[PDB]
Structure 1
């Protein structure tokens, strides 16, 4: 009679379509709780994300609505896809929860980062990130909050990006949960405005952490984080600071100066496989790319296209893998009730 059933998972109550069986909790991010399950209809395992009352406030609503729309229309093998979307509630008045069904992946990038990685897999994950990023930039999407906890991978080293980044407005929250800021670009830290290669900084932070196994630029707030950045990379040039607004210019130019470590000192030979000649050269190529991704001034930072052409990365290069036909706009303020309906009717395609 009923085409849904409910079960308790960790805390939440998952009411899902009967095709999905044997639910098990596998995570809990900010926007929801996530279960693995078996899809009897597709005969495969899937991940199911539960959004509770996404329309409950502006922040949630914008994110949920955006997530749902973009993930539906954006298609690329390094961006996570929607398999199915549903709500167990029958009417707009009763509507509460949204369920996103996605491919089931094996791990976080955070998990992978902790592992000793060879050059083949390091360059391959990085290639896949750059292709994902590339696609998003083509579709008019610039992420600005790429981070290893929002990137998932499979045992076969397949990689997918989970989310579509910052809102082109941006906020407030009540839920107690800390937002991870360490992978954000200087231009996001300092409020400069940005271009596509804002996301390259993040990839540089991930790459560098894969090597060093520590977060490059930690800190309680953007104040500490900025310090960590200038300590390691040195203070930027005045051509860069001619692009800062008056108040942040003053703040930055009045921080204690630093000369900056060279990249061999930042990522020394010790941290790389360097036993064979193959590995010796790949280490050299690795550090080169790093030095071009982790530069404070975006004017001097490498682009996505030039990163994909870099020797460390272009060994994977292929035809329909770097490009495919890419495509409406929305970014405006609404009340709860208005968001509720926008999202309900996105769910009911």
Structure 2
């Protein structure tokens, strides 16, 4: 029951994730190995308890190497369900998006911001249920009902909100909303819209100018495109919030393959 076998390498952060199988129960758990920041990731992980967030089981430091025991997601990365230049079937994208929102609402509800939402950090279990993963950049943005503004520039360029690049301080929530919009764009088009949302990035200027006849926008149906128009808004104070995303026409459209 307490004896585990490392059977296969799952991924690398960095910098390796291995699959551990219990010799008695045959239960599986993912083991994140870090050479050996991490202390914080463990503290935040201990707070997490939601169906759309990778569950944290425990940790073990055997010297300069730290071990994190996590809920195994046999479906792998959402990234790998995205066909380059195509995306995935709209009903599948919508279901994953609903699940992503549920996980994000949960984190924000407990005062946690992930800060690095992207398909490589969204995993799938055996039933294709989405699980938010990789809390190495996550931080507290609300404590004792008091919000703290962020100032650290972090994340992954194609997914980061424009205010992160332009402002000294910014609200946490709209940044996570923005990255979810970039994820939705990738799922529906199989391509990222820009290298970064900077004034010098032509693709970002094109979006700001509403040239939706260009890729990746041209590949996206008007309905989800209308939602993206509300999410990928430059001014974070004008950007759609999650409660309003839940009211969006596409978000509530019945879809079937």
4+ runs deviating over 6 angstroms: none
The structural deviation recorded for 1:18 is 6.3
Equivalent residue, structure 2, for 1:212: 189
Equivalent residue, structure 2, for 1:301: 239
Q: Give matches, 1:36-185, under 5 Å.
A: 36-53=19-36, 63-88=37-62, 95-105=63-73, 106-114=75-83, 116-164=87-135, 165-167=137-139, 170=152, 180-185=156-161
- In structure 2, how many angstroms separate the alpha carbons of the residues matched to 1:40 and 1:263? 56
Q: What TM-score, normalized by structure 1, do the two folds share?
A: 0.61
Alpha-carbon RMSD: 2.8
**Structure 1 stretches lacking a partner, 5+ long:** 1-16, 54-62, 89-94, 173-178, 235-258, 273-282, 317-349
**Count of matched residue positions in the alignment of Structure 1 and Structure 2:** 239
- In structure 2, how many angstroms separate the alpha carbons of the residues matched to 1:160 and 1:260? 33
Say whether the 8 Å CA contact 2:89–2:188 is kept in structure 1: no
> Cα deviations across residues 212-245 of structure 1 (Å, max 9, x unaligned)?
21121116xx75x8514532222xxxxxxxxxxx
Distance verdict in 2 for CA 1:81–1:299, change over 3 Å? same
**Structure 2 stretches lacking a partner, 5+ long:** 140-149
Q: What TM-score, normalized by structure 2, do the two folds share?
A: 0.81
SS in structure 2 of the partner of residue 76 of structure 1? coil
Say whether the 8 Å CA contact 1:107–1:153 is kept in structure 2: yes
- In structure 1, how many angstroms separate the alpha carbons of the residues matched to 2:131 and 2:24? 24
SS in structure 1 of the partner of residue 28 of structure 2? strand
The structure with more radius of gyration: 1
The structural deviation recorded for 1:42 is 4.3
Richer in helix (by share):
1
